[PDB]
Amino acid sequence: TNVYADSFVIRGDEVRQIAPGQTGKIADYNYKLPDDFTGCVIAWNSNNL
Amino acid sequence: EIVLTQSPATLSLSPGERATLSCRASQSVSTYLAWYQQKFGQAPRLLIYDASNRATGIPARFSGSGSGTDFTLTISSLEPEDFAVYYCQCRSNWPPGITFGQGTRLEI
Amino acid sequence: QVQLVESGGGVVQPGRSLRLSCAASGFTFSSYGMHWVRQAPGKGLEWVAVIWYDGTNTYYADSVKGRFTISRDNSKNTLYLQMNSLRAEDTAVYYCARDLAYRDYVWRYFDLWGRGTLVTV
């Protein structure tokens, strides 16, 4: 249960920084995702819209 | 299913000039297309992935562009290192697979 | 020395079976997914099989659905592949390949290629 999922529209390069225990600018001031996080990350093209 | 349609059937051109091939996909693929360059007998090596991204080991004289069902590759300066055949490639959901094109030969 | 070398090339009658191998070397085997793509004589590339880096999932192309078995043994860091019900079209240069991505599931690109083994029937 408790299968919570997100939605963000974010800058291309910064994508990789969204992983457990990783630094940067989003990882500090815009988002934290828990350390030892076992969940799943899915991304794709939205320049088209 | 996506069947790639390649034009012109062949190119004949002098070295040093600008060579532009076109690959018209049947239906939109977003941004997800690759180019493969195969010399006669050789092993093909990826050139372009994501349909404008210059993969590693590829001098900047290789450029490609396009999205949806328009995709074209340009070469600035042809040299005998570059005179080969070329395919346009992608991936699928229904039925999962890959469809290549027919191939496009280059001549002096 | 980041290379794959295939193994098991030979000739067999129609209806029979063959088992091939790819040896991997120069990198950590159990961290990338593996493909085998086969290049029929005089023809283009046709993907045959894949395996995820953790060997939990495989997909096979339609031409080989239910007929080949893809498997990795990390003990020797050697990939294998069994074959069943080979037919005349199956003649090819099986290039064992390595997936491009480290720990991504998308499985689109082949970054590194075995020299390719002839197999004909």
Q: What residues of C are in contact with residue B36 (Cβ under 8 Å)?
A: 45
A3: left (phi over 0), alpha (psi -120 to 50) or beta: alpha
CA distance C112 to chain B (A): 9
CA distance A12 to chain B (A): 13
Burial of residue C59 (CB within 10 Å: 0-12, 13-18, 19+) is middle
Q: Nearest 10 degrees: CA dihedral of A28, A32, A37, A42?
A: -100
Collapse the DSSP code of C29 into the 3-class scheme (helix H, G, I; strand E, B; otherwise coil) and give the result: helix
Chain C residues close to B93, C-beta within 8 Å:
none
Query: What is the spatial order of strands in the sheet that B19-24 belongs to?
Result: B5-7, B19-24, B71-75, B62-65
Q: Which residues, numbered 17 to 46 in chain B, qualify as contacts with chain A under a Cβ-Cβ cut-off of 8 Å?
A: 30-32
B&C contacts, CB < 8 Å: 25
Beta-bridged to residue B85, according to DSSP, are: B38, B105
Contacts of A25 (CB under 8 A, 6+ apart): A14, A17
Query: Subunits with at least 3 CB pairs below 8 A relative to chain B?
Result: A, C
Element (H, E) at B75: strand B71-75
* DSSP state string for A1-44: -----------SGGGGG-STT--SSHHHHT----TT--------
Resolution at which this structure was determined, Å: 3.1
Cβ atoms of C103 and C53 closer than 8 Å: yes
Q: Is B9 on the interface with C (CB under 8 A)?
A: no
CB B64 within 8 A of CB B48: yes
Smallest Cα distance from B78 to chain C, Å: 24
Per-residue CA distances from B23 to B31, B40, B47 (Å): 14, 21, 15
From residue A49, give the alpha-carbon distance in Å to each of A9, A41, A44, B3, C70: 11, 21, 12, 25, 40
- Residues of B in Cβ contact (< 8 Å) with C61: 97
Instruction: Tell the burial category of C119 from Cβ atoms under 10 Å away from its Cβ (0-12, 13-18, 19+).
Output: buried
Distance CA A30, CA B71 (A): 37
Q: Do residue C116 and residue B36 have CB atoms under 8 angstroms apart?
A: no
Contacts of C113 (CB under 8 A, 6+ apart): B43, C4, C95, C96, C97, C98
Question: What amino acid occupies position C75?
Answer: S
